[PDB]
């Protein structure tokens, strides 16, 4: 289905779809392929989960439901039609879909059609309403009555299937074919009208049963056992988890990249217990104001250093021209994209990736030179008034990029040389 990497890369229409959904994706994609000419497959190669998420979001569909039961008759009536529910009616009733498609594009209008439909007795029959000759219906819609009837016959023919004997009431009533007793009660048998004909409640009940069967066979779509069926689980062994416990052997390496004696510590301990029982003065704790002054110097130096650390506690406010700010952000963004793709190629590790690595290396070099030329532009645009800040802002991505270039050169010298 539409789930492989190849399928997701193939769906150019879906790619354009979420493209048109976003705006920064036009920005990024335009710079990536329109401006830089990157292979758009490798563009989308990162965004594969996003593509699949968009596809699966677009791909779901609802389940069937009794749309005619949700239809209410609502003096006068005003049509308040919902197109999704109109198509729901179409899908649930292909007869109604057919009656739409041979009349509205031929004879009259859609709201006129639906007014005729709500007027029609075919609507009442398809809904849970007993048909009545007092009702006149709509003649145009009610011409489809026998067509819907033979649809019902064909659908019932499709719905017929053999039954399991374990639950077969037909086999149950065919237990004794020579039962000769008495005629059962009118009360518990299906009653009829005065002239022997039925009222049709059996028809409406078999119709709603047909609706149920249609729903369950819609469930039963494309998208022996009695031994298991008759198991009595209540007298069986309880399930126990096979979860594995874990122990932990403990032997850690010592931290890598004079010794005191009991006599000496005991001597000092005796002496300091003597001093402890001897004396203790709070007033002697006051310092000499000179080594204390050096303490003041050290403390104040620490305060100054950490205060300058705290002095640099939406992005930050900047005094850049807004266009050059956007341009440099754009260049940073596409350089980051190039760098990520180059790392994807490099950490892949194949000889098939070699020309890709070389070409992305060329693109990184081009981005470097374009960064330098941008630096020349902000040079002769500022006289290095804040072109220094421009260079420093674009610095770290450039450092990482050129570090990657050095890594590529080093591995080239490692393998080839």
């Amino acid at each position: 289905d539409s789930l492989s990497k190849e399928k997701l890369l193939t769906n150019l229409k879906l790619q354009q779809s979420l493209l048109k959904g976003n705006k920064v994706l036009m920005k990024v994609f335009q710079e990536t392929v329109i401006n830089a000419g990157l292979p758009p497959s490798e563009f989308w190669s990162t965004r594969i989960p996003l593509l699949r998420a968009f596809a699966l979001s677009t791909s779901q569909k609802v389940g069937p439901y009794n749309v005619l039961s949700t239809i209410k008759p609502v003096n006068k009536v005003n049509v308040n039609l919902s197109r999704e529910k109109i198509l729901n009616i179409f899908e649930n009733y292909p007869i109604v879909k057919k009656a739409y498609t041979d009349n509205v594009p031929k004879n009259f209008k859609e709201p006129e059609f639906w007014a005729r439909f709500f007027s029609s007795k075919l609507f009442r029959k398809l809904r849970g309403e007993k048909i009545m000759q007092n009702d006149r219906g709509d003649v145009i819609i009610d011409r489809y009555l026998t067509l819907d009837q033979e649809f019902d016959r064909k659908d019932d023919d499709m719905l017929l299937h053999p039954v399991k004997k374990i639950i077969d009431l037909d086999g149950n009533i065919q237990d004794d074919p020579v039962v000769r007793g008495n005629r059962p009660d009118f009360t518990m048998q299906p009653g009829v009208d005065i002239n022997g004909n039925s009222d049709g409640t059996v028809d409406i009940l078999k119709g709603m049963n047909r609706l149920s069967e249609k729903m369950i066979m819609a469930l039963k779509n494309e998208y022996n056992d009695e031994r298991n069926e008759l198991k009595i689980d209540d007298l069986n062994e309880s399930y126990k988890t096979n979860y594995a416990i874990i122990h932990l052997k403990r032997n850690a390496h010592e931290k890598t990249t004079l010794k005191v004696s009991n006599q000496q510590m005991l001597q000092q301990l005796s002496l300091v217990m003597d001093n402890l029982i001897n004396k203790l003065d709070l007033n002697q704790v006051v310092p000499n104001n000179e080594v204390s002054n050096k303490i003041n110097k050290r403390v104040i130096t620490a305060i100054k250093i950490n205060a300058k650390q705290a002095k640099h506690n939406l992005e930050v406010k900047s005094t850049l021209p807004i266009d050059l700010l956007e341009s440099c952000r754009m260049l940073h963004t596409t350089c980051c994209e190039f760098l990520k793709h180059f790392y994807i190629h490099f950490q892949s590790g194949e000889q098939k990736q070699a020309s890709t690595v070389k070409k992305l290396y060329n693109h990184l070099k081009d981005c470097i030179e374009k960064l330098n030329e941008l630096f020349q532009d902000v040079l002769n645009g500022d006289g290095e008034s804040m072109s220094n800040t421009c260079t420093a802002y674009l610095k770290p991505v450039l450092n990482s990029i050129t570090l990657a270039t050095h890594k590529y050169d080093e591995y080239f010298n490692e393998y080839n040389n």
């Binding site: 150019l12 790619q15 354009q16 493209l19 048109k20 036009m26 994609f29 335009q30 329109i34 758009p40």
Partner: peptide, 21 residues
Amino acid sequence: EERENEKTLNDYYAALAKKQA
């Protein structure tokens, strides 16, 4: 190949079309 080129050129038109919009 050649048949992939018109597809990208179709994407080229769509990218230009979304630009003015």
